[PDB]
């Protein structure tokens, strides 16, 4: 819907894949760089969505 | 010999991030000859005049030249602290230099437009440890640390880009973001000229 939900999205998908796999690190890694694109961008929502992407994963 | 600016004059011009330079030694410029293809809209310089620019003897005369639309024009300056000068192009401080923008007529057909312009708004490392952002600024005479994560051309305004450090780089992240800039009917170009003068042979100096 907009660059930094594209972008945050990837970024998400990706750290699925590592939390499968046992990569805990790379999760941790690939959720705070999603968190501070969220931020950087001032997009309330989308910061929400990591939240409900976290707790369900 | 004469100095051969026509590598300029041939192919799509870069964006200003991946500013292509010509650097010239032990020849004769005719500046003229090479301004007279364009239409010039702003000719400024810092320690020289553009007088002066076109008619002293250099140890050496630098040329960067790149795609750049005249309505950034404030943002490409000596005196400016945008994302221009802080994340894609900074000029000596220490030499004279002298900042050109053009417009490419439309009979100049050897230099062709790319899509947009574009340029970098955020060049950053994330610190993982800290939690913190630290902007990585460019250097004079260097390409932003960001032009490997960064397309030629950026695809949307306010896209994002990363690369994934090692442990043995610091680890984190190295985070971008681009901007663009609608194309003009006619392509506009920047030109940034570096001379020295030097304690050897002033081998660089203009055609009689
Ligand atoms: C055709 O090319 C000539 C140069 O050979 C262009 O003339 C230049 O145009 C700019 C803008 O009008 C001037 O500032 C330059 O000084 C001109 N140069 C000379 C030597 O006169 C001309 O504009 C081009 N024509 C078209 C239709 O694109
Ligand atoms: C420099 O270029 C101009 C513009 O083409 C030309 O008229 C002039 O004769 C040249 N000067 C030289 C070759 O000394």
Not at chain 1, 17 to 24: L, N, S, W
Not at chain 1, 42 to 53: A, G, S, V, Y
Not at chain 2, 48 to 73: E, R, T
Not at chain 2, 96 to 103: E, F, G, Y
């Amino acid at each position: 819907g907009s660059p930094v939900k594209r972008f945050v999205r990837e970024v998400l998908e990706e750290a699925e894949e590592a939390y499968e796999k046992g990569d805990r690190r790379q999760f941790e890694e690939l959720l705070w760089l999603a968190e501070w694109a969220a931020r950087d961008a001032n997009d309330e929502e989308l910061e929400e969505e990591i939240r409900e992407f976290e707790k369900e994963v | 010999t004469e100095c051969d600016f026509s590598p300029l004059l041939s192919g799509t011009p870069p964006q200003v991030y991946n500013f292509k330079r010509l650097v010239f030694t032990n020849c004769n410029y005719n500046l003229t000859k090479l301004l007279s293809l364009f239409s010039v809209n702003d000719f400024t310089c810092s320690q020289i005049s553009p007088a002066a620019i076109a008619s002293n003897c250099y140890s050496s005369l630098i040329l960067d030249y790149f795609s750049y639309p005249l309505s950034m024009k404030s943002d490409l300056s000596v005196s400016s602290a945008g994302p221009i000068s802080q994340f894609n192009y900074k000029q000596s401080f220490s030499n004279p230099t002298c900042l050109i923008l053009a417009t490419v007529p439309h009979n100049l057909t050897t230099i062709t437009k790319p899509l947009k312009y574009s340029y970098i708004n955020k060049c950053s490392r994330l610190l993982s440890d800290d939690r913190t952002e630290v902007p990585q600024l460019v250097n004079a005479n260097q390409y932003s640390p960001c032009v490997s994560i960064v397309p030629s051309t950026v695809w949307e305004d306010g896209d994002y880009y990363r690369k994934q450090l090692s442990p043995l780089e610091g680890g984190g992240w190295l985070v971008a973001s681009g901007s663009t800039v609608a194309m003009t009917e006619q392509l506009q170009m920047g030109f940034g000229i570096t001379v020295q003068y030097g304690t050897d042979t002033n081998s660089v100096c203009p055609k009689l």
